[PDB]
Design a protein around this ligand. Structure first.
Ligand SMILES: CO[C@@H]1O[C@H](CO)[C@H](O)[C@H](O)[C@H]1O
Lengths: 16, 133, 16, 133
């Protein structure tokens, strides 16, 4: 672990 | 382009973007919610100026984005986001820009966009979205 | 809440 | 078509699907992980035969999907999912089907696909995915 919480991320769009 | 990454917040109150009808999406700034208070995000500006500014002011918290969509295409040699549309449970904002090129969309059945990251040069190159319940 | 746990769902893609 | 909704699980072990190189995606079935045991999802079958089967066996848990992409378009008057491609951190599986019509894609920077739902008649009409950290 680290102490930074995490979050779902989707992407990228825009020819990447 | 210059990379950006707002991180994650608790929802979205307002989106300030700009575009040009001959080119693409220029600048991008979000007013997040942070635990029921407004948080004014960094303002991610294009290297050039000339764009038409738009303010999408959502009726938070009852109004929220359900789909983001757009077009990517080539502008003066750069492949960029040429168009954006934001559809909420209340109405559709956009298309802003030029709706030509390859389409993309992120429709959400359950959950919230709670942040943006991406890259902006002359135009918006690409973006990702943080999602959360 | 109810006692049913919740998940992020993205979509649909295809027919509307 | 007939609706299906597998729910959410701990991860994905195998995808079994079928496709036709002139039409669209047909059958779809998933072997999920559920807390370390394989959970054999219901085989969601097309109404018609004549498809080619593919087994995508993933090296769970070190290998996982990072991007689902595909095309949607007409077959017989219906908008359906014409192709799918599954990119993991280890390799690419597909495209399977017919790579024509409207592109779509879901790339994931962080999180996991843990469930599918959708509808299949003669072909895969539409689908959505459950995401989790
Ligand atoms: C031709 O039968 C149909 O299959 C289609 C394409 O998959 C749609 O699902 C229709 O609802 C189902 O009736």
């Amino acid at each position: 672990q680290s102490g930074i919480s995490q979050t779902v991320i989707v992407g990228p769009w825009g020819a990447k | 382009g210059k990379a950006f990454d707002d991180g994650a917040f608790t929802g979205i109150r307002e989106i300030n973007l700009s575009y040009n009808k001959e080119t693409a999406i220029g600048d991008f700034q979000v007013v997040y919610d942070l635990n029921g208070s407004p948080y004014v995000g960094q303002n991610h500006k294009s290297f050039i100026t000339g764009f038409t500014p738009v303010k999408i002011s959502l009726d938070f918290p009852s109004e929220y984005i359900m789909e983001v969509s757009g077009y990517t295409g080539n502008v003066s040699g750069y492949v960029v986001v040429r168009s954006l549309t934001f559809k909420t449970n209340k109405k559709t904002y956009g298309p802003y820009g030029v709706t030509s090129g390859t389409p993309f969309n992120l429709p959400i059945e359950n959950g919230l966009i709670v942040g943006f990251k991406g890259s902006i040069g002359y135009w918006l190159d690409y973006f990702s979205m943080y999602l959360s319940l």
